[PDB]
Every structure is written in structure tokens, then in C-alpha cells.
Design a protein around this ligand. Structure first.
Ligand SMILES: OC[C@H]1O[C@H](O[C@H]2[C@H](O)[C@@H](O)[C@@H](O[C@H]3[C@H](O)[C@@H](O)[C@@H](O)O[C@@H]3CO)O[C@@H]2CO)[C@H](O)[C@@H](O)[C@@H]1O
Ligand SMILES: [Cl-]
Ligand SMILES: [Zn+2]
Length: 234
């Protein structure tokens, strides 16, 4: 019945300093059109439970694009969540990505110890975190990073391995070509168990609209680049 998820901000590492504000970055990976919230913006702000000291975020208050209530998490969808803070020195801290499903509603994310490569920023490591009661089926989300590394954790159910690699190439091949080399893309395929030609076909279908208008979408690698990175001849 509880549509809230909770964050244990007690006994944080010294690096986190004194928590001032807590934020929840909850997003769909596959099977939902959930709008993404601005990182550490108003829509992400978590309330403090003054009784328990836990912070919480109500998934029942997630908004759709038309500003109405989204009607909660969907059953046949992959979600991921990050809890973050701004400390009394205005410095940001965050958990890694943790997989999220309906069984996790009413449960608490806590820091496990250890850090992991930030997905966006090679200068940063996030803090390993998982669910208190749902770690059997949910936990750290395996992510393809800005460097083309595949982080520790679980893979999605409703996003194919080929689609995951296609999305990484779409995200990073133009932005970070010194990392997104043919060697790196071969390594990604090996780590996520995707067939390169499946990645090429997935990319071509997924990003057809952007591929048709390079002038408008310059961060979308053209098919010729994607074929070269995957070592395939289409
Ligand atoms: O929205 C989906 C997206 O969410 C997560 O990305 C967030 C990062 O985890 C978070 O750190 C932040 O990234 C910023 C860096 O902290 C900052 O140093 C600098 O590099 O800018 C980054 C933003 O470009 O915000 C993003 C969300 O925008 C998740 O990790 C991703 O895998 C996921 O795709
Ligand atoms: Cl890792
Ligand atoms: Zn790495």
C-alpha cells in the first residue's frame, strides 16, 4: 500500500558532510514514458520523516508530461533510482543507480560501503547502495558509462542487451570518441552479451529520425561511424 521509497541518511561517510537537502532522481529505463526530473531540482526534493529520521519520495506524486499524476510505477517496466544530497557546504553527493520495481515500494535505500564509477563524469565515484528488504531481486544497476565501462549490478528485463549498447553509442560515440573506440565497443558487446550486428540494426531502427537530420542531431553518430565502432559490414 505504501507508494513511498525511503533513504537512510544516518551514519553517512565523512565525505557526505552534514546533509542540508535530499533529492530522488527516479527514471524509466524501459516500458514507461515517465518524464525525467531536473537533477537536484524542486521536483526531486525529498521530505524528512521527523519520527524515523529517514528521507522519502512518494512515487504516487510523479507527474506525467500533461502535469497530471502519473498513476504510479508500471508492472512491465524497468526503473532506476538515485538518492543524492546537497551538504551545508553546497557540495553534491549521491548513491549509484539502483534498480526499482513495485516490490521496492515502502522499502529503504542505504549505503553498503564501496564506490563505483559515475555514469556521466569520469572524475566522480558514486556510493554503492541497495534495498534493505528487496536486495534479493533489486540493487545496483549495471550501467554503460561515459568511458564505455559496464558497471557492477543487474541488467534490465525489458531493454535488450543490443538496445543497451546502441543507446551507449548514441549517448557517447560523438561526445567521447577517445573512449568510444572500436576496442571499447567490442568490450561493451562482450560484457553485456550483445551481438554487434544486433547493435547496428537496433541503432539504425531506434535513431532513424535523428540519422535523417544530421544538421539537427550532431551528437547522433552516423551509421558509417556505428559500423566502424562495431567492426561490422552492413
Ligand atoms: O536521467 C537518467 C540518467 O540519470 C543518472 O544520471 C545523473 C548522474 O548520475 C548525476 O551524477 C548527474 O550527472 C552530472 C554530474 O554529477 C556532473 O558532475 C556533470 O558531469 O554533469 C552530469 C550531468 O550531465 O545527473 C545525471 C542526470 O542528468 C544516471 O546515472 C544515468 O545513467 C541516467 O541516464
Ligand atoms: Cl564496476
Ligand atoms: Zn570505468
Amino acid at each position: 500500500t505504501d507508494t513511498k521509497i525511503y533513504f537512510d541518511a544516518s551514519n553517512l561517510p565523512a565525505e557526505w558532510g552534514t546533509t542540508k537537502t535530499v533529492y530522488c532522481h527516479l527514471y524509466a529505463v524501459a516500458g514507461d514514458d515517465l518524464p525525467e526530473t531536473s537533477w537536484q531540482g524542486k521536483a526531486e526534493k525529498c521530505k524528512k520523516d521527523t519520527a524515523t529520521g529517514l528521507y522519502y519520495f512518494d512515487t504516487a506524486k510523479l507527474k506525467s508530461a500533461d502535469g497530471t499524476n502519473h498513476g504510479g510505477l508500471k508492472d512491465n517496466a524497468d526503473y532506476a533510482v538515485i538518492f543524492s544530497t546537497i551538504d551545508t557546504k553546497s557540495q553534491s553527493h549521491q548513491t549509484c543507480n539502483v534498480t526499482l520495481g513495485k516490490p521496492c515500494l515502502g522499502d529503504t535505500i542505504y549505503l553498503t560501503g564501496g564506490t563505483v564509477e559515475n555514469t556521466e563524469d569520469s572524475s566522480k565515484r558514486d556510493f554503492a547502495a541497495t534495498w534493505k528488504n528487496n536486495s534479493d531481486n533489486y540493487g545496483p544497476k549495471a550501467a554503460i558509462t561515459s568511458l564505455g565501462h559496464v558497471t557492477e549490478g543487474r541488467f534490465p528485463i525489458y531493454l535488450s542487451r543490443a538496445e543497451m549498447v546502441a543507446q551507449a553509442i548514441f549517448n557517447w560515440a560523438v561526445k567521447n570518441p577517445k573512449n568510444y573506440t572500436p576496442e571499447t565497443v567490442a568490450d561493451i558487446c562482450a560484457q553485456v552479451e550483445a551481438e554487434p550486428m544486433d547493435v547496428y540494426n537496433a541503432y539504425a531502427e531506434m535513431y532513424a529520425t535523428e540519422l535523417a537530420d544530421p544538421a539537427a542531431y550532431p551528437d547522433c553518430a552516423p551509421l558509417t561511424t556505428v559500423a566502424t565502432l562495431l567492426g561490422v559490414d552492413p
